[PDB]
Design a protein around this nucleic acid. Structure first.
Lengths: 95, 98, 110, 84, 97, 85, 110, 95
DNA sequence: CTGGAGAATCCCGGTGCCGAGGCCGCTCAATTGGTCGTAGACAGCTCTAGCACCGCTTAAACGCACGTACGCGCTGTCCCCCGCGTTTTAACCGCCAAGGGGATTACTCCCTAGTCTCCAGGCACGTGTCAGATATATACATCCTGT
DNA sequence: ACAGGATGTATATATCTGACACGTGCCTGGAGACTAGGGAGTAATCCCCTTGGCGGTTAAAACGCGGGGGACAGCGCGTACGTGCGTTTAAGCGGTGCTAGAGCTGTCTACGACCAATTGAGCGGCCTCGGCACCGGGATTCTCCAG
């Protein structure tokens, strides 16, 4: 066997199975989805990085992520993400 | 006999004039009030550094000026000399802002 | 040394995306000296949400064209039809995606 | 200080717009442009100030600094030189 | 005779190619063009097949987008025929030249 | 059997350029466009391929990989999904 | 240790830009885990070079208008009249810079 | 009693004295030059950062800086910058 | 068209200023000697894809024909935006003062790297069958002719 | 407006393939307890800029009075490229084979952080004076208008 290269394949499949259990996905579509996840990931991390740097802070907290998301995602898309993340963060601190 | 210039002469003189000089073309106080008004819908009772208001006016004039340069080229391309709203709309579409 | 029964951080947040893997990518990715504990959970939630948002529209697109397995064309349609999502991916090119059928009104015959 | 502003968009007046166009190289301006221009500028300002204030709340400040505006301009690929 | 009027088959092509997704440039001629342009930087360069394909993907997507913007510029000027000047205007406003 | 190529710019044939414009929504095409199009595409490719090779020389590799092209595209603000990253 | 006297690494490279300061900004700047010794010297050299190009052109522009003090307008003219610098700075705006005199041919009186 | 806010002023002035000994510079122009220096610095360091990341290396050497310069600077600017850079690095290896 | 006129701008030359160049403490960031972990440089094995290479089918491409719609040049028309006079509006400009907040200085404690270890999710490696990729023959869109 | 007819296109039905869903094997990255440093929240202060706020000067936004060129419908003409026929021509496709460099594996020794001690470059703050910013007045060009 070879140098193992990881991807979001199984996670995209689990989300697909929650939103559309009877729907599949082609290999090319999985590639496109993986590139999308890596892209959005790098953008959010980059903005959070800039936020921490501009304000002379050395920690990326949920606040930097939230502000970063508000900067990158247009309007209501960001709001529900901030909504979901809030739930997530809340629920996490109780588990 | 009276003394009036032909349309465009004073216009071009202003073009050469304001293109040679470098002072800001929007009036300070009205623009500063527009900025504060627009800012109200985000946070109540915001205070502004003087330089922040100046930087906004500087960026605003530079942005609009560049947009008019492209709008002008679009107008000229359509065998006209008068910029129209649809030229601005075309320019923004080609650029990617709408 | 029998420690406690483990359980993924994604499950603690009721998420599908890997909180742990994202956290690892963050530490070794040169973004900040340290990364807060809530950052990966929040980030994974946002990525999973966006993934669900696009996969849902894609699913509808595939159902409408009588196919059950998603292919690139449906992704291109999915992204370009949601104005906000379109804005988010306005400078991205999707391989084998084609374009949305959009013919300017004046060009059609009558 | 309980104060509120209204219709200040009329402050960017006709001779100022025609000045901006002249520095941009415009020679003739249709009367309909002014309403269009105020709207275009508004959108731009709406976007930039929104991001600006977004930086401001993250820093836990109540005063929008010049740097906030500079970073905002950088955020949209319209980098500005001369303020830090 | 059954000659179709100008534009009908054109529109049919528009719908036909806008409904499908296959690549529109011939793989081998393009592949040679890539290797020829690449020559002037490093001799005896080798390519991954997927790289040449990725170039064709990028290339056709870039051109298609340019023609969309170009087409809007043409329609704006009350024409229906794209011309070099239109492409030049597009590239100028985009900031590529 | 080392081979130096010439005139492959003619491989982007006129039908193919028509097809590209068709997918772009173009209805009528002047005959002068095709040579001009070859020039435009050339500049684009010149810009991208050069940078790709620039990445290649850094990695001490003799083969241009797909990823090199992907990063090249990323460098010019034309991110491409579907080949790796 | 009553050591040898200190020489700025800039002087070692015969440069005016601070190799020391740049090196620190690189280390504390979250760019990579390690920064090679030659990187800041090479970088400082390139920054000083580009600085010299813009200053030299601005200098000429200032002299050609009988002024000895460089003001923003010259920096604007200097950057925009060099094709390669113009290409390097196409998305940047210089405060108080103005615009290069450029009137389209078709607008001049006939 | 203030806080040290560093700048590139003195270095732009030194270079200015070497290139145009009889020419001065206004405060605002020095600010603009300082922003330009920080801008080019961040660009070059950013490209070097990703270049290091792609090839799974953790060190930014002259190679990465050079390749980053070739990627960011158009034509002759890049060529002469590599000439000046390489010359300087060579000279630096002696001392 | 071709000089006569008349003003807007340019030039030339003069006066207090405050922005800019320089000085003077004065503080901390660059330097510099070790010192050590470990990161990428180098030798070399494997093989899979990359590339050179033969044979035929046929679909993609090239040369033409012609004709019909397409760009573009001129002409005429309202209208509408520009130039200037005038005047009110209100920004500039200076100016006084209260103060809120921000840019700091102690001070902490709590929040996140750091280690080791356990083992369960995640990835290659197959793999089998069910979407699926294209053939065969339908009425209907549909486009054009011609009415 | 108004049917008739003659052809692309979606519909329905059909057959072998191999892509993807799933099983299996195995491996190392996520987690969990614990530890230990130090980053950013919390309190309180100085002062300084930010904002409120009066009085007057004058630049400037506003209305309008023509009026003259500018956008645009329209007519009309001569290339010109779309559609299609027909013919190569060369790409697709498969089909071989060689091999060479990707790509990994296993050696290291070189190269860059870690530390602290020292001190001289950089800055803050505070000076003086010199281009400079704008005024006063003639000339050239610039734009225009009558012969």
């Amino acid at each position: 066997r070879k140098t193992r290269k990881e991807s979001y394949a199984i996670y995209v499949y689990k989300v697909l199975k929650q939103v559309h259990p009877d729907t599949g996905i082609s290999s090319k579509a999985m590639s496109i989805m993986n590139s999308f996840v890596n892209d959005v990931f790098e953008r959010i991390a980059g903005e959070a990085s800039r936020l921490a740097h501009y304000n002379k802070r050395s920690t990326i907290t949920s606040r930097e992520i939230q502000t970063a998301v508000r900067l990158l995602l247009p309007g209501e898309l960001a709001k529900h993400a901030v909504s979901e993340g809030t739930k997530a963060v809340t629920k996490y601190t109780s588990a | 006999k009276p003394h009036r210039y032909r349309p465009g002469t004073v216009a071009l003189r202003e073009i050469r004039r304001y293109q040679k000089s470098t002072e800001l073309l929007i009036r300070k106080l009205p623009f500063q009030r527009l900025v504060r008004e627009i800012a109200q819908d985000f946070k109540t009772d915001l205070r502004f550094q003087s330089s922040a208001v100046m930087a906004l006016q500087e960026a605003s004039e530079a942005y609009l000026v560049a947009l008019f340069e492209d709008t002008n080229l679009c107008a000229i391309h359509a065998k006209r000399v008068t910029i129209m709203p649809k030229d601005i709309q075309l320019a923004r579409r080609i650029r990617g802002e709408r | 040394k029998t420690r406690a029964k483990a359980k993924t951080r994604s499950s603690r947040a009721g998420l599908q995306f890997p909180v742990g893997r994202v956290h690892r990518l963050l530490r070794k990715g040169n973004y900040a000296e340290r990364v807060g504990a809530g950052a990966p959970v929040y980030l994974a939630a946002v990525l999973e949400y966006l993934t669900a948002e696009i996969l849902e529209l894609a699913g509808n697109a595939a159902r409408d064209n009588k196919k059950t397995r998603i292919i690139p064309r449906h992704l291109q349609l999915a992204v370009r039809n949601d104005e906000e999502l379109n804005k988010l991916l306005g400078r991205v090119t999707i391989a084998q995606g084609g374009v949305l059928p959009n013919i300017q009104s004046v060009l059609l015959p009558k | 200080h309980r104060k509120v502003l209204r219709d200040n968009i009329q402050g960017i007046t006709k001779p100022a717009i025609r000045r901006l166009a002249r520095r941009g190289g415009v020679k003739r301006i249709s009367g309909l442009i002014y309403e269009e221009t105020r709207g275009v500028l508004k959108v731009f300002l709406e976007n930039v100030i929104r991001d600006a204030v977004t930086y401001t709340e993250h820093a836990k400040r109540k005063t929008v600094t010049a740097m906030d505006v500079v970073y905002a301009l950088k955020r949209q690929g319209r980098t500005l030189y001369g303020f830090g």
